[PDB]
């Protein structure tokens with residue numbers, strides 16, 4: 001229905017606003033674009049599904065996310081990729097792991113404060129009907 005298409009349009013407006021707020025935070029600059037395969041040639045042998053905040057906005061605009069749950073699976077993949085590629089005790093690995101955990105915790109905290117639980121349940125019920 002047109003009312004269901006209006007629901008998904010509101011979901012996209014909300015996800016673009018959350019993603020912009022993460023992308024301007026100086027702590028998260030390393031997660032704003034794909035890892036450059038020229039600069040890091042073993043990256044795509046270790047990490048089988050690369051993800052970053054520029055790819056996330058592209059996916060919102062392609063109508064890939066029909067729930068906040070499917071959006072958070074990609075925020076979780078940005079964080080888990082950083083923990084798996086950079087697992088060592090040295091300061092550069094520890095700094096990126098700390099930033100990755102802060103990106104995930106910031107996204108979940110914005111959604112807990114600003115997403116209505118009945119708006120998410122409506123999106124999940126339209127998705128399950130398709």
Ligand SMILES: CC(=O)N1C[C@@H]2C[C@H]3c4c[nH]cc4C(=O)[C@]2(C1)N3C
Pocket residue numbers: 030031035036039040081082085086096
């Ligand atoms: C997000 C993530 O896991 N990394 C690991 C890469 C290694 C190191 C680097 C050196 N030159 C480009 C680089 C990157 O893009 C990354 C981003 N680092 C900063």
